Amino acid sequence: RHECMAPLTALVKHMHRSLRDLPSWMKFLHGKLGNPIVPLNIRLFLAKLVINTEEVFRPYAKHWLSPLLQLAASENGEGIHYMVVEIVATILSWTGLATPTGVPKDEVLANRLLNFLMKHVFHPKRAVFRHNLEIIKTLVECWKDCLSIPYRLIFEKFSGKDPNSKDNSVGIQLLGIVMANDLPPYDPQCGIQSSEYFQALVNNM
Numbered sequence: 001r002h003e004c005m006a007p008l009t010a011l012v013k014h015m016h017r018s019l020r021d022l023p024s025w026m027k028f029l030h031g032k033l034g035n036p037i038v039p040l041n042i043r044l045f046l047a048k049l050v051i052n053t054e055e056v057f058r059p060y061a062k063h064w065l066s067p068l069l070q071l072a073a074s075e076n077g078e079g080i081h082y083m084v085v086e087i088v089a090t091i092l093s094w095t096g097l098a099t100p101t102g103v104p105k106d107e108v109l110a111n112r113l114l115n116f117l118m119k120h121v122f123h124p125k126r127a128v129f130r131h132n133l134e135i136i137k138t139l140v141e142c143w144k145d146c147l148s149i150p151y152r153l154i155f156e157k158f159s160g161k162d163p164n165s166k167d168n169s170v171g172i173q174l175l176g177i178v179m180a181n182d183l184p185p186y187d188p189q190c191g192i193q194s195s196e197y198f199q200a201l202v203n204n205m
Contacts, residue, residue: 002078005045009052016056026057034067036074043071047083051090061098065091066106073112081120085135088113095142110146118154122170129170133177140178149183151190151197159200168204 015024032038033046050068057064068091075084100106121136123129140147158171179185188194 002044002048005048008049012049012053012056016053020059021063022057022060026060030063030067033071036070040076044083047071047087051086054090054093058097061094062102065098065100066103066109069100069106069109069113073109073116085132088135088139092139092142099143100146107146107148110143111148114147115150118150118157118174121174133173136174137177137180140183141181144181144183147183149178149187149190151187151194152192155191155197155200159204162203172201172204 021027029046033043050064054061054064068087072084072087072091100110117132117136121129121132123132154171154175158168158175160168160171186194186197191197
């Protein structure tokens, strides 16, 4: 809870009230954020400020998302996954008002964050884990454009070593949640085998 910057939020609110690029000392911030070469502390400061004041620069999300998007990628000290979930929720606070489809880079970074989340979608508390579950639910039900189901590693995270343990069921749950949308059940070019990829399902059942 690094908090020594509330007057920055106050002045941002005042500038919004006292006053499609809007360089109200803003494009300077966008440039200093777009480069992924800066100590992570400054990234944390700007992340807190945008998390507090996204509503000010609402008619600029179509350019705001991409530097934030690459900031989310490779995000490596007060708990990294915390700020990860808040920034992804804030960047998903809109659905059609801004979307990651204009450049190949946005789909690339969307795939990267997908990989990170699905390799890290678990918590023993089973409620914040469920919280992650509706996070994936919301993102898959909103975007459907930059999304690219891997079908390779998800195979073994639902299948596993075939134990009696209740470990891989998270994979089955995430498959069901993402398949609540109209996504294809299985891409033959993905998952390599694409045939016994469901045999693992029947063994798990």
